[PDB]
Amino acid sequence: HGIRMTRISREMMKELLSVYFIMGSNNTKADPVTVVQKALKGGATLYQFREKGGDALTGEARIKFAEKAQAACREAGVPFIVNDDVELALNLKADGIHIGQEDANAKEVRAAIGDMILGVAAHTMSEVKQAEEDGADYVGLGPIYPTETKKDTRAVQGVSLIEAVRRQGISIPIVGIGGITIDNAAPVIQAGADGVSMISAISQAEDPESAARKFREEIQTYKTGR
Ligand SMILES: Cc1ncsc1CCOP(=O)(O)O
Ligand SMILES: C=C1C=NC(C)=NC1=N
Ligand SMILES: [Mg+2]
């Protein structure tokens, strides 16, 4: 994955969303970069650098951690997506940026990043359609299930929005997020999602590599079966 000179295709974007690992240093008790490396080795298809909050690294320390995580992704041949930080994404030549509703304006971000991958968090039909109109390459829908990893969370919606979006004929790449585990991932794909994203199921697993591998196998099976 080099410098993109064209918008990513729907097909490729959907493949990348399969097992979307998201992590910051405060999401694990182990060595951060090591966990990322293990998740990639196990089979994560996309990684999002999400380092924020009172327990996260800041300044130069955060930037250096970002560089190492990006290096790990490059070694695994997996794209590196930055959460919220547009400047960081541009400075590191990340493969993409993921933003939320409270964040900035998707239209503005799309203009600033050229043909880089753009993900937008959406919780309602209106937000999903607006994200598509603004030029997002994918939307993250959730919380699907209960989760404490992110406290300022919206109401749990199961796979309701995913189904609604598909029923309306919207084909934008979708990834589910929120309390997803190997045990409850299948229904997310069955509802019409193109993959699952998670933090704790992998970051806090006693065996992150095996957890990621189990996810990879499960998701592939269900994509073929739907
Ligand atoms: C970042 C985020 N956004 C909505 S729910 C959530 C947390 C995902 O963490 P976990 O996979 O551990 O529930
Ligand atoms: C809120 C989010 C929604 N979707 C994804 C993929 N990541 C997030 N951090
Ligand atoms: Mg955000």
Coordinates of C-alpha atoms and ligand atoms in Angstrom, one line a residue:
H1 CA 0.0 0.0 0.0
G2 CA 1.8 3.1 -1.3
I3 CA 0.8 6.7 -1.9
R4 CA -2.7 6.5 -3.5
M5 CA -3.3 8.4 -6.7
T6 CA -6.9 7.3 -6.9
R7 CA -9.8 6.7 -4.5
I8 CA -9.8 3.2 -3.0
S9 CA -12.2 0.8 -4.7
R10 CA -15.3 -0.4 -2.9
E11 CA -14.1 -4.0 -3.3
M12 CA -10.7 -3.4 -1.8
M13 CA -12.1 -1.3 1.0
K14 CA -14.5 -4.1 1.9
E15 CA -11.7 -6.6 2.0
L16 CA -9.6 -4.5 4.3
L17 CA -12.5 -4.1 6.8
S18 CA -12.6 -7.8 7.5
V19 CA -10.7 -7.8 10.8
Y20 CA -10.1 -4.2 11.7
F21 CA -8.0 -4.0 14.9
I22 CA -8.0 -0.6 16.7
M23 CA -5.7 0.1 19.6
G24 CA -3.9 2.6 21.8
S25 CA -1.4 2.0 24.5
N26 CA -4.0 2.4 27.2
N27 CA -6.0 -0.5 25.8
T28 CA -3.6 -3.3 26.9
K29 CA -1.5 -4.3 29.9
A30 CA 1.2 -5.7 27.5
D31 CA 3.7 -3.9 25.4
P32 CA 1.7 -1.8 22.9
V33 CA 3.7 -2.4 19.7
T34 CA 4.1 -6.1 20.5
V35 CA 0.4 -6.5 20.7
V36 CA -0.1 -4.8 17.4
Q37 CA 2.6 -7.0 15.9
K38 CA 0.9 -10.1 17.2
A39 CA -2.5 -9.0 15.9
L40 CA -1.1 -8.4 12.5
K41 CA 0.7 -11.8 12.5
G42 CA -2.6 -13.4 13.4
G43 CA -4.3 -11.9 10.5
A44 CA -5.7 -8.4 11.2
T45 CA -6.5 -6.9 7.8
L46 CA -6.5 -3.2 8.9
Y47 CA -5.2 -1.3 11.9
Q48 CA -6.2 2.0 13.4
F49 CA -3.9 4.0 15.6
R50 CA -6.2 5.4 18.3
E51 CA -4.2 7.1 21.1
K52 CA -6.1 9.5 23.2
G53 CA -7.6 10.2 26.6
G54 CA -6.0 10.8 30.0
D55 CA -4.1 7.5 30.1
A56 CA -2.6 7.8 26.6
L57 CA 0.8 8.9 25.4
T58 CA 1.0 12.5 24.2
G59 CA 3.5 14.7 22.3
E60 CA 6.7 13.2 21.0
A61 CA 6.1 9.9 22.8
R62 CA 2.8 9.5 21.0
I63 CA 4.4 10.3 17.6
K64 CA 7.2 7.8 18.2
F65 CA 4.7 5.1 19.1
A66 CA 2.7 5.9 16.0
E67 CA 5.8 5.5 13.8
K68 CA 6.5 2.0 15.3
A69 CA 3.0 0.9 14.9
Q70 CA 3.1 2.1 11.3
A71 CA 6.3 0.2 10.8
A72 CA 4.7 -2.9 12.1
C73 CA 1.8 -2.5 9.6
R74 CA 4.3 -2.0 6.7
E75 CA 6.1 -5.2 7.6
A76 CA 2.7 -7.1 7.6
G77 CA 1.5 -5.4 4.4
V78 CA -1.5 -4.0 6.2
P79 CA -2.8 -0.4 5.9
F80 CA -2.2 2.1 8.8
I81 CA -5.2 4.3 9.7
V82 CA -5.0 7.2 12.2
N83 CA -7.9 8.1 14.4
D84 CA -8.9 11.8 14.6
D85 CA -5.5 13.3 14.0
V86 CA -5.5 14.6 10.4
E87 CA -2.1 16.4 10.8
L88 CA -0.5 13.2 12.2
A89 CA -2.0 11.1 9.3
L90 CA -0.5 13.5 6.7
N91 CA 2.9 13.8 8.5
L92 CA 3.4 10.1 8.7
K93 CA 1.9 9.4 5.3
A94 CA -0.6 7.1 6.9
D95 CA -2.9 5.1 4.6
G96 CA -6.0 6.8 6.0
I97 CA -7.9 8.7 8.7
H98 CA -10.9 7.8 10.7
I99 CA -13.1 10.5 12.2
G100 CA -16.3 10.9 14.3
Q101 CA -19.3 13.1 14.3
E102 CA -18.2 15.3 17.1
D103 CA -14.8 15.6 15.3
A104 CA -14.6 17.9 12.3
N105 CA -16.3 18.1 8.9
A106 CA -15.9 15.1 6.7
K107 CA -16.0 17.3 3.6
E108 CA -13.1 19.3 5.0
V109 CA -11.1 16.2 5.9
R110 CA -11.7 14.6 2.5
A111 CA -10.3 17.8 0.9
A112 CA -7.2 17.8 3.1
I113 CA -6.3 14.1 2.6
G114 CA -6.5 13.8 -1.1
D115 CA -7.2 10.1 -2.0
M116 CA -6.3 8.7 1.3
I117 CA -8.7 6.3 3.0
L118 CA -11.5 8.1 5.0
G119 CA -13.6 6.4 7.6
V120 CA -16.5 8.1 9.4
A121 CA -18.3 6.9 12.5
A122 CA -22.1 6.9 12.0
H123 CA -25.0 6.0 14.4
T124 CA -28.0 7.1 12.4
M125 CA -29.3 6.8 8.8
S126 CA -28.9 10.5 8.3
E127 CA -25.3 10.4 9.4
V128 CA -24.6 7.4 7.2
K129 CA -26.0 9.1 4.1
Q130 CA -24.1 12.3 4.9
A131 CA -20.9 10.4 5.3
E132 CA -21.3 8.9 1.8
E133 CA -22.1 12.3 0.3
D134 CA -19.1 13.8 2.0
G135 CA -16.8 11.3 0.4
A136 CA -16.1 8.7 3.1
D137 CA -14.7 5.4 1.9
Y138 CA -16.3 3.5 4.8
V139 CA -18.5 4.0 7.8
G140 CA -18.1 2.5 11.3
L141 CA -21.5 1.6 12.8
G142 CA -22.1 0.9 16.5
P143 CA -22.0 0.2 19.3
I144 CA -23.3 -3.2 18.1
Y145 CA -22.9 -4.7 21.6
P146 CA -22.2 -3.3 25.1
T147 CA -18.7 -1.9 25.6
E148 CA -16.8 0.0 28.3
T149 CA -13.7 0.5 26.2
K150 CA -15.2 3.8 25.1
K151 CA -17.4 5.5 27.7
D152 CA -18.9 8.4 25.7
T153 CA -20.7 5.8 23.7
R154 CA -24.1 6.1 22.0
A155 CA -27.0 3.7 22.6
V156 CA -26.3 0.0 21.8
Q157 CA -28.0 -0.7 18.5
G158 CA -27.2 -4.4 17.7
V159 CA -27.2 -4.9 13.9
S160 CA -30.3 -2.7 13.4
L161 CA -28.6 0.2 11.5
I162 CA -26.5 -2.2 9.4
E163 CA -29.7 -3.9 8.2
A164 CA -31.5 -0.7 7.7
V165 CA -28.7 0.8 5.6
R166 CA -28.5 -2.3 3.3
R167 CA -32.3 -2.5 3.0
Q168 CA -32.3 1.1 1.6
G169 CA -29.9 0.0 -1.2
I170 CA -26.8 1.7 0.3
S171 CA -23.7 -0.2 -0.6
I172 CA -21.0 1.9 1.1
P173 CA -18.4 -0.3 2.9
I174 CA -19.5 -0.9 6.5
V175 CA -17.6 -2.1 9.6
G176 CA -19.3 -2.8 12.9
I177 CA -17.8 -1.8 16.2
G178 CA -18.5 -2.2 19.9
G179 CA -18.2 -5.2 22.1
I180 CA -17.4 -7.5 19.2
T181 CA -15.9 -10.9 20.1
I182 CA -15.2 -14.1 18.2
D183 CA -18.4 -15.4 19.6
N184 CA -20.7 -12.6 18.4
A185 CA -19.0 -11.5 15.2
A186 CA -20.9 -13.7 12.7
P187 CA -24.2 -11.9 13.0
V188 CA -22.5 -8.6 12.2
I189 CA -21.4 -9.9 8.8
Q190 CA -24.8 -11.7 8.3
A191 CA -26.5 -8.3 8.7
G192 CA -24.6 -6.9 5.8
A193 CA -21.4 -5.5 7.3
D194 CA -18.1 -5.9 5.5
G195 CA -16.1 -6.7 8.6
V196 CA -15.8 -6.2 12.3
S197 CA -13.6 -3.9 14.3
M198 CA -12.5 -4.4 17.8
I199 CA -10.2 -3.3 20.6
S200 CA -10.3 -5.4 23.7
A201 CA -11.2 -8.8 22.2
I202 CA -7.6 -8.7 20.8
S203 CA -5.7 -6.1 22.8
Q204 CA -6.6 -7.8 26.1
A205 CA -6.5 -11.4 24.9
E206 CA -4.0 -13.6 26.6
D207 CA -3.0 -14.7 23.1
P208 CA -3.6 -11.7 20.7
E209 CA -2.2 -13.6 17.7
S210 CA -4.5 -16.5 18.0
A211 CA -7.5 -14.2 18.7
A212 CA -6.8 -12.3 15.5
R213 CA -6.4 -15.5 13.5
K214 CA -9.7 -16.9 14.9
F215 CA -11.4 -13.6 13.8
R216 CA -9.8 -13.9 10.3
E217 CA -11.0 -17.4 9.8
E218 CA -14.5 -16.7 11.1
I219 CA -15.1 -13.6 9.0
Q220 CA -13.9 -15.2 5.8
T221 CA -16.3 -18.1 6.4
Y222 CA -19.2 -15.9 6.9
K223 CA -18.5 -13.6 4.0
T224 CA -18.5 -16.7 1.8
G225 CA -21.7 -17.9 3.4
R226 CA -23.8 -14.7 2.9
Ligands
LIG1 C1 -13.9 3.0 19.7 C2 -15.3 2.6 19.9 N1 -16.3 3.3 19.3 C3 -17.5 2.9 19.5 S1 -17.5 1.5 20.6 C4 -15.8 1.6 20.6 C5 -15.0 0.7 21.4 C6 -14.6 -0.6 20.8 O1 -13.9 -1.3 21.9 P1 -14.2 -2.8 22.2 O2 -13.9 -3.6 20.8 O3 -13.2 -3.3 23.2 O4 -15.6 -2.8 22.5
LIG2 C1 -16.1 5.0 16.4 C2 -15.5 4.1 15.4 C3 -16.3 3.6 14.4 N1 -15.7 2.7 13.5 C4 -14.4 2.4 13.5 C5 -13.9 1.5 12.5 N2 -13.6 2.9 14.4 C6 -14.0 3.8 15.4 N3 -13.1 4.2 16.2
MG3 MG -13.3 10.6 17.1

